[PDB]
Every structure is written in structure tokens, then in C-alpha cells.
Amino acid sequence: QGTLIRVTPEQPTHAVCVLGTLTQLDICSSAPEDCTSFSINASPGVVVDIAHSTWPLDPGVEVTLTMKAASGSTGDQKVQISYYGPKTPPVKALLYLTAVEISLCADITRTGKVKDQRTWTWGPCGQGAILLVNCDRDNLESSAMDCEDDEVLDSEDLQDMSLMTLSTKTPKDFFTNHTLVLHVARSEMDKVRVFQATKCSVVLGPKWPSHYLMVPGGKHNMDFYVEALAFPDTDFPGLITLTISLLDTSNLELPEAVVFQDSVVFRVAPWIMTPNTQPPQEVYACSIFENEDFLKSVTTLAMKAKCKLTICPEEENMDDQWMQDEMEIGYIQAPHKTLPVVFDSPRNRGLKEFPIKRVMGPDFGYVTRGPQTGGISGLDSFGNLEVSPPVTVRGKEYPLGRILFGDSCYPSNDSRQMHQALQDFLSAQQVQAPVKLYSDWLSVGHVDEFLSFVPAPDRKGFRLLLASPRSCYKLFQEQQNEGHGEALLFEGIKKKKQQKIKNILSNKTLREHNSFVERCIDWNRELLKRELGLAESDIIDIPQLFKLKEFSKAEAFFPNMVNMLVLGKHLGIPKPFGPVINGRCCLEEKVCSLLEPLGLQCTFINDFFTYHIRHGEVHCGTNVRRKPFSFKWWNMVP
Amino acid sequence: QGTLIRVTPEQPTHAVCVLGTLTQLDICSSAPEDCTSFSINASPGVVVDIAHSTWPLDPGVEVTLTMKAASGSTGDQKVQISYYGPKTPPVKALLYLTAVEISLCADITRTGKVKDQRTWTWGPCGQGAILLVNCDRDNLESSAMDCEDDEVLDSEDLQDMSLMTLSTKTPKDFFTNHTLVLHVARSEMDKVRVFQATKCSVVLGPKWPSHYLMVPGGKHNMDFYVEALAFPDTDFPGLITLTISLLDTSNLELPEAVVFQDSVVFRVAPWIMTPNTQPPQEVYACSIFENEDFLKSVTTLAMKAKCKLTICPEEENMDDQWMQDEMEIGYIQAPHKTLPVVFDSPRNRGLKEFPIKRVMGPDFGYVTRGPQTGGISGLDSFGNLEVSPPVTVRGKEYPLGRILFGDSCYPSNDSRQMHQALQDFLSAQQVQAPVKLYSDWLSVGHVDEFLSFVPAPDRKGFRLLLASPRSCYKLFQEQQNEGHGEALLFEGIKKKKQQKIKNILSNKTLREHNSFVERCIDWNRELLKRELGLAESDIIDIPQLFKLKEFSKAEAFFPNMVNMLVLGKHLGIPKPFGPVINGRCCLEEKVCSLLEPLGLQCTFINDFFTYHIRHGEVHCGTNVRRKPFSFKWWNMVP
Numbered sequence A, B: 001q002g003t004l005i006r007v008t009p010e011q012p013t014h015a016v017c018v019l020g021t022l023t024q025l026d027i028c029s030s031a032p033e034d035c036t037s038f039s040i041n042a043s044p045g046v047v048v049d050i051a052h053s054t055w056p057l058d059p060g061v062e063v064t065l066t067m068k069a070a071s072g073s074t075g076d077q078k079v080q081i082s083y084y085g086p087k088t089p090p091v092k093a094l095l096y097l098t099a100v101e102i103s104l105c106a107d108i109t110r111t112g113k114v115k116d117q118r119t120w121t122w123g124p125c126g127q128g129a130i131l132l133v134n135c136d137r138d139n140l141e142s143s144a145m146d147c148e149d150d151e152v153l154d155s156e157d158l159q160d161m162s163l164m165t166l167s168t169k170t171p172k173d174f175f176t177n178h179t180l181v182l183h184v185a186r187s188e189m190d191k192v193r194v195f196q197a198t199k200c201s202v203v204l205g206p207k208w209p210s211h212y213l214m215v216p217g218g219k220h221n222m223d224f225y226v227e228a229l230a231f232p233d234t235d236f237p238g239l240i241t242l243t244i245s246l247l248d249t250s251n252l253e254l255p256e257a258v259v260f261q262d263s264v265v266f267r268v269a270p271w272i273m274t275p276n277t278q279p280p281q282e283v284y285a286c287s288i289f290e291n292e293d294f295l296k297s298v299t300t301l302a303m304k305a306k307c308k309l310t311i312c313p314e315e316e317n318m319d320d321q322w323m324q325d326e327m328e329i330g331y332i333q334a335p336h337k338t339l340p341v342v343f344d345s346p347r348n349r350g351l352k353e354f355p356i357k358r359v360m361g362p363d364f365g366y367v368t369r370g371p372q373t374g375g376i377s378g379l380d381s382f383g384n385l386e387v388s389p390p391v392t393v394r395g396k397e398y399p400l401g402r403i404l405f406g407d408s409c410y411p412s413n414d415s416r417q418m419h420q421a422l423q424d425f426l427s428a429q430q431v432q433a434p435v436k437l438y439s440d441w442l443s444v445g446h447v448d449e450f451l452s453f454v455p456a457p458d459r460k461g462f463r464l465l466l467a468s469p470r471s472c473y474k475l476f477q478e479q480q481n482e483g484h485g486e487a488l489l490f491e492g493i494k495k496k497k498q499q500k501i502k503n504i505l506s507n508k509t510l511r512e513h514n515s516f517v518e519r520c521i522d523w524n525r526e527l528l529k530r531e532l533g534l535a536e537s538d539i540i541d542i543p544q545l546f547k548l549k550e551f552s553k554a555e556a557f558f559p560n561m562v563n564m565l566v567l568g569k570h571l572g573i574p575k576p577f578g579p580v581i582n583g584r585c586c587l588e589e590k591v592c593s594l595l596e597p598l599g600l601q602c603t604f605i606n607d608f609f610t611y612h613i614r615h616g617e618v619h620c621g622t623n624v625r626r627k628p629f630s631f632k633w634w635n636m637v638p
């Protein structure tokens, strides 16, 4: 800020001046009469500026003091104002000043180093410290997030927290007559916790919003550790402001008087997803009855992609094989710390405990949203939550991509949507600027059922894959044209009725159902084209047929090959069991023919009696954790 | 959006094209073999563009159709694609198109007239309709806001609502196979209500988020009337989006298929305050026991300022004389309608019914916030809510000024604040960008106790007034210097102890208390200087003394003259009853000497045994409604 010091010849004044503050002098308000003019002398530590060697006494003349260094003792710098007139012997008003340093410091340049306007600004030319939600369990002992209680129990825990340092320089007796208090608005106290480091004891938090600091005179440095307890959300834009106030306590009869305030503003780091184009690090599945052979194929694939593997046994599954749906593995990121965090869906089926019990842990965060009992729908399953690779759309850059999730085309009595709380949560993270797609036409309702993304060595570095009946018809028609109309879809499967290409192509109901699906998909195609700035050369159609079953909702006619596992270049694609022609399933060949030229290795995994007949595939039965973007979210300008 | 139409020689295709849409053609995906090249002929209503007179058949060649006018009948425009090769006789794929107009229209230029990107943008170069919260009572009958029920009862009510028109142009039989639906996200349905005008019946609202529209083929225009039901707030940023979807219902077996969507986005108009610099229109007070003479002075003043007058009798007051505190009169503003709206404080003392019963009415809105029973504090009284005149601060313009309200310097066990719900509400209005000041040091705790603003003919067009002990000391000292030390403050008052200037100036405790107040005020001075971009020449000090009573909180030593009524140039200033010197109270003269040169007329109203001894003055016992800014809030860029 600044302060106006009001000087008089009545007697001397005493004031404090915090270094880095603009201090100002009111000279004319008590200049005695007889007087035209004034002069200023000051001790050598005080710099005096005058705009608008002695000056006339005009009320809009401006005088400012700054102080080069902290006072060694009270009143050790002096200012002397001398009023005089044509025939008037000079009179002196005296000002005794005490200078001090009060620097509340934090990582506002975002480099791991703590060294007027306290605002937070995005971009690489911007400013403001980052703060992480301390939502992992470093505490080996119990089952709660670190930040739910009032204590630092491990010292590891401090690595997650943000460092703020108060740095004072004062006369030795200064806190005789002054006290410093640290504080946070009541508005924000339930979202941050602040520990004083001496070991560590809480000083600010949900229970207390202010704390008198115990600070010795001289040069002193006090270290604070800060954790956030809430992600940005609909009712929290994600800034937390911490303030240091300096109080004058000189008069034992009067109340304390504020002399100086400074702040730092923190922005709580958002939860961020990883697209399939990000290198994989760890893979997840369930093990259930008659599953074994699916799991070896997956194991083989992980191994080729360097990935840690992780399975969930039937004692914990409770029959729930759909590892995709209960959770999503994202990250949070600060200059000093980056760590994965599981977004745990309120789906709450058999896998309900898996995210809490097995995933949340040392350097592994947890978050959840929406109602935990009831109020939910299939569209809340995280097979319906994906994210694009980075894209630029008509000049605006989405360096972390854009979250995608499925929705209906309009709300009705029969329509489903992802719960508002999740949608609200995802938008509040800002940096991935969610897009709504149309998936309610699918029986299960998930965007993973009609799309996937894969890395590609050229263009923008990926391909959007989309399921395409058009493409499967063209392929099958082609095969009929070269004589293979007799070929049998479902060849090699027992307790299932083979069907010939000729009878498939002639089936008019099937051709109708697929035309309706073609429309549902094409709608999303243009939608993705617009909202991700894609062109056709970014997109590849995967031959895929559907059918309409109950409520005229759409299921996969044969294994949904786009519902694949993407481990870098190693694809784990469902086994279509197509019509076999010249030794090979023509589906597999068509796919390979589209993906192998991009460096991709296609492994066809058999999921037929395990997952496909249960209305899901490989992607639906697995999950991946992947490398965080290198791009720092705070450099975006959402 | 756009649509991709996929053409084949297999058979002809049929499609709809909404005018103003980019329609695109996939030619290569089924071009028969034998074929190098293609040509396009089309009926005269279809415009064909090709980038990248006959063209080679390359998949990245681009073909787009636009249509000049609505179809008179189904398929009345044709496109014919001819594939051919070196030795291959031409083959034709046929596309039959139906063009239609679907224009959902609203006042997006903000001029009272309804005639791709559906976003709302601020500023005078921006775009997006405005929508008002229908929070008045045009319904003469009952006591609820118009918008709480599901019906339009008066036709006057429609003047408050916003007009949206659907404008279609189709073949006569078009809605044989297509249906239009109007909708709003479930997220927003509890905040808007939409009536179809035929008279008017609700079609969208809290209970229903979609509605099948009954629309004849041909040229038709359907009128909708929209009201909002919620102001922008912490959980509502203030946009409401209404969408028209076009569905294909051709196939009786398949589900409906979306063909086209368009939207309009409305922004719900914020509640806006009026500073004292805005011309007055209506004045409010109470009448109580032994009040009569206060009320005549006020009546006289209103009359000179052209103002409607309005009083509240003791049957309704219930002893509550503080008309300032229970309410604040602001406005809401759309291009088609502007109307005042009372913000009604949760204070809920004797005047509790006055805003509901007597102020809310025909072209008079109502709003309220915060808890209605308990949870409140004195700082929630609207003597603690003010607004500045328009100001520019370091280049950023605040054309409606900035709300000011009082707060503590930091939260403690003894501190008070205005309730979070009000603070949140005020910030959510955006356009007045509230500033927090320090008022908790006052016993009562209100910013009207230390500041006021008044119009001024020069400079920025106002003066900030601030209470100033400094100034009262200087004045009194001056009077002692010219011999009048003997003069008596409280001269002319019975049952009150006169005190001489000499004994006042010598009273060291009083001089101490006032020094502490001087600091509390000076803190706000710099605070206002910064946040309103003020300079000293914008500010005038009003001589005023205080004392500290209970919890060392500050009360007025003599009637708080800055707690005045401002009716344009006609000021209604409390009667200080100062020491009388040369026929006149020197306080009154000092004030007059500061204000009369700005054109201001100072009337000193006696409120001493009526209000001053009850810890409030003229401003505290009254209220004003004033002319809305002419500047349209939506032209701001907050």
C-alpha cells in the first residue's frame, strides 16, 4: 500500500516504514502560520522525492520517503521539516522513523525456489505460487487422506506441501510494541491448512483463520508448510490467499491498529487426465473365473510396453471385471511435486474398494464426486470419461487435450447423463475444457465404445479411431465381390451361429440398425472435428458392426475392436473372429492394414465368453496409468 | 455445425440441409472401381464449391453444398455425381436434398429487436441476449414474485420477459417425418422459464427441460417469452442456453436421429446499485414518537430535489426507525426493460416486512440473501453497503462504480464480517467489483459512518467525504487561537453537559481515542485511494470527533455529519450543535465553507434525541432510490 504520515511542529511524530512501501508526507496540514516555504533534511538512510532545493508550501506538492535498509533500532532514521517565511525564523517539525523488512515469500515464479499486486496470472509470462491437494496417503498406517486431520505425521508428507517463508528484519525490541498475525479469510479456511515449521504445528486451518506469530526482533526467517484440502470445484475457483498483518500494540488501552498488510495468492492445482497418446506406466485388471487366457495376452503386452502390471483378485473384485469403469488415473502437478491421483467414480459396484484400498497410497492421490448411494447412471462409469491428445483449435491451444464424455442429444424422461457433480468438477479443473459427446444411443452408453486415440509418427502425432459400419460393409462387400461371400463370421466359435458374408450383406434390418448407428457416430465425428480442430486425415475408420437391442440401444455385433488397450505402439484389440479368408480373419487384416503403417503392433485378444457376451471388451476390462504431460498446466491460458 | 453426406451409386441418397450450415460430400468412399474422375451437376438452387471443370477422384479433394433457399417440397433440389475413367462409361450417384430454415432468434445485439458460435461476450463489440430475473409483483393480487409459479397472469408481465422467435421455412409435409424439440440443460432448468405464445403456456422450466414443438410446414413463426428465476450467484455464473434440436422421425422402428442443433445464450442481468452521485427519485423514512420535526426537514429537502416521498408508520415500523439498514434499492436492466429492485437485508428487525409488503410491486423487484433467522451481524445492515461513483483505476474502467462494504482487518473471535452469502452475491454481480473496507472498529460497524460521496461540478464529478478528527482539532484550535476557547459545544441542548473548546482540546484521552480513529479512517483513505484511483483533490475531510465506548469501539462524539442525505445538490447533514461563534455553529460554517463552493446546499437537520443518542444519524434513518446509470452494464468488460 502506502501510508500518509502527518507531520506537525506541535511535537515530533514516530512512525514505522515497511521496506518496499511508498511512504508519503502531509506537510501542509499543520504547517504553522507565518510560513511560505519548507525544506527537508533527513538522515542518510532516508531517500526523499519531490515532484510538482527548497520548495513553496503548496498542498499538492508531493513528498515521499523510501528506506534503504532495516533499522537497527527504534527511530534510528530521522526526518526534519523546516518551515519558514520572508521574516519568520525557521521552525522544525521532527519525524522519527523505524524501518523494517516484512516479506511473506512463496514460489510465485514456479521454479521450486522461494526467494505490490498480489494476483495470480496464468501463462508463461504470469505469476503465482502453486499448491497441491494433499489427497494421497503417505501415512503408511491408516486409510485417510493426509489432509483430513490436523497433523504432519511423516516428514515425507512435507514434500507434497508448499513452502512459504516469512522473512523479517527489525530492531531487537520491535515486537515489544508490535505483533504480526497470519491469516486467511473464513471463506477459504476450510480449504487450506498451514503448518509452522520450527517439526510442525498447525497455525491455520478449518478451525482457525488467524494466528499471532511469535517472532524475535533482529533478522528472522520462519518457514510454513501449506496443503490444500479441496480441488477447484463449482463453489471454489481455486485461489487461496494468505495474509500477514502488522499490528501496532503500543497503547495498552486502545485496540490494535493495522500498519501494513501483504499477501501471497496460491492456486490449487487441478486434476488432469492422460490421453492414450501418453506413454504407459502401469496396467490394471481383474482376475475372475475362466479369465486366465485373456490375462496372459494382457501380461505379454504390458511387458512389451515396459509397464508395471497390477491385478485385482476375485476376493476384492466381488465379480466386478470392469476395471475401466470404477476409476480414472490422472495427476496433479506443482513445481516441487507431481503425483498421480485416482478419480474414483461413484459407480460403486464390486470394485468399490479398489481405488481406496489398493490405488490410493504413498505418492498416490485420491478424489471422488457425486452421490455415493444411488442417484447414478451407467454414463457415470469411467469408460465414459476420456481425454484427447493435445490439439490447437482455430488458434486456441489445448496443450493437455480436452476431456471428452458422453451425453444424450437432449434431456428427456428416457435420457441419461453423467451426474452434474462430475461434469461440474471436470469443468472446474479448467485446463482440459471438457467437451460433451453423444453416447446415450449405446446400450452401455460409453464414448470408449465408439472412439479411441493412438499415437502416430506424423501429422499431429495421433489418429482418432472411430467405429464404422460403413467400413465393415465396404470390406464384406469387397470379399463377396472376390468370391468369398460364402465366408463365415464367428468361424472358430462353439455355441454360436456362424453367418455368411452373403447373408449379412443381405440382412436389411441389420443394414438399417447400422445406418442409424452410422448417424449417431457421424454426429460425433463432426462434433470432434469442430471441438478438437480435426481434419479427415486425422481420423481412421475401424470396420465395426452394431445391432439394436433393448430400448433400441446399440450393442456390438462382433467384438468392438475400437475398445482397445493402447500401450504406446502396442495395441490390445478385441478379437473380432471375422470371416476367415486366405488364412486370416479379414477384419484383423483390414485393421492391421490401417494401423501397421503408423508403427502400430496389433495383438488380437480373445475376450468373447469372458467380456464380449457381457457387453464390454478389452478396454472395458482394463485401465492404465500414464506419464503426465511435460507441459506445465499453469502455463496454459484457459 | 456441418454434415457429411456419403454418396453412392448403389442407390440414391436423401438428405436435409439446414440453411446457413456447411454441407459436405464424401465422394470417394463408395466411388465404384474402374474410375479416375468425377463431375458434378446440380439443380439451380444448389451451390457447389471445390478446392484442392471435372476433377480427379482424390480423397482430400473437398466438395461443399450450400442452399440458397428453403425447399418448396421434399427432394426438390438434386445433385448428381458422375464417375468415369479412361474407358469407363459414366455412372451417376444421385443425391436428393430438402432445404429448410430453422432460425432460433433473440436480441443478441441488444437493441430491442429480434431479427455459428453461440457464446456470450461482453463489451460494446460483443454479442448475446439479456434476460431479467422476473422478481417484481405485477400481479396486483398476491404477495409472490411473478416467477415463482408456472403462469403468465397479466400481459404487463410479458414486458419484463425476453422474446425468442423460432422461424421456420419448410415443405408443407415436412413435420410428417421430422420433429423439433426445444430444450435447456437440467443444470439450468431450475433457473429459467419459457412460455409459448399462441396467450401463453409454459413449455420449459424447472419441471420440464424439453418440449416437442407443434409446428406447421411452410413459413411459420413461433414466439417465446423467457424469464429468469435466479440472479447470478456463487453457484450460477449467469448464462442460460436454450437449444432447438431437429429430429428425423422417418423410421418408425428406429429411434429419433438428431440432424441439426442451434442455440441462443442469454445472460441473466445483474443487480446493480446507485451511488449518491445519481439523481434522486424517491425517499424513504419511518415516523415514530417525537419524530415530527426531523420528518419536516426531510420533507422540505425531498421537495427541493423533486423526489417522491414515502414514509413508514409505527404500525409497520414496529419501533424500527433505521430505514437505511433493512434494504438497498438497486436496479436490473435489459434493452427492453429496466426496473428497480430492492435488495432486502437479512437484518430482519422491525422493518422486516417493509421491503416485501410496501416496496416490492408493479415494476419493483425483490431479492434477498443470507440466513433469515440468526447467523447475522450488524455488518449485514445496509448502512454498511455503499457504491462509489464511476471511476477509472490505472486504466481499468468501472463505469458503474464499485460496491464498498465494511469488514474487519483480519478474522478473529471478536471480529465481525458481512455474511459470506451477501459478499458472494455482490461479487457474482461482477459489474461493481466490490471492495472491502475496514469498518469493524466502529461500534455499529458501517461504512456510512465514515464516508459519503457528493456530486461536484469539476474534476471527476464528485467528492469523497471522510470523517476527520484531525480537521475538527485544527478548527477548534483555530477558534481558541482567536479567543473563543471559552465557546460551548452542545450549546442549545437541555439535559446535556456543555463543554468548552479549551477543555476539549486539553482532554488527552479524547485526543488519544481520536488518534486511533484517525488511523482507522486513514487506512481506508489509502485503501479507497488505491482501489478507486483517487487523488487527494478528490477527497474532502469533514471535521468530526469520535470516542471509544464498549469493546473500545468508536461512536460519534457529536452528530456524525458525514452520515448525511444526498439529494443531488441538496445535502441533509446532521446538526452538530457545535460551539456558537459570531452567531453560527463553527462546525456548520466549516462544512458550508467546504461544500458550498461545489454548488452544494447544506441543510442541518436536528436528529439529536431522535437518532444521535440511538447511535445513528440522518443517513441511517433514511433511504433513497435513484436513477439507473445510462451506461448499459453489458458494455462493461469486467
Ligand SMILES: [Ca+2]
Pocket: A146, A147, A148, A149, A150, A151, A152, A153
Ligand atoms: Ca496430515
Ligand SMILES: [Ca+2]
Pocket: A134, A135, A136, A137, A138, A146, A156, A157, A160
Ligand atoms: Ca502427502
Ligand SMILES: [Ca+2]
Pocket: A326, A344, A345, A346, A347, A348, A352
Ligand atoms: Ca467408487
Ligand SMILES: [Ca+2]
Pocket: A136, A138, A156, A157, A159, A160, A339, A362, A363, A364
Ligand atoms: Ca506424497
Ligand SMILES: [Ca+2]
Pocket: A324, A328, A382, A383, A384, A385, A386
Ligand atoms: Ca476412461
Ligand SMILES: [Ca+2]
Pocket: B146, B147, B148, B149, B150, B151, B152, B153
Ligand atoms: Ca408468473
Ligand SMILES: [Ca+2]
Pocket: B134, B135, B136, B137, B138, B146, B156, B157, B160
Ligand atoms: Ca413481472
Ligand SMILES: [Ca+2]
Pocket: B326, B344, B345, B346, B347, B348, B352
Ligand atoms: Ca429482511
Ligand SMILES: [Ca+2]
Pocket: B136, B138, B156, B157, B159, B160, B339, B362, B363, B364
Ligand atoms: Ca414489471
Ligand SMILES: [Ca+2]
Pocket: B324, B328, B382, B383, B384, B385, B386
Ligand atoms: Ca446503503
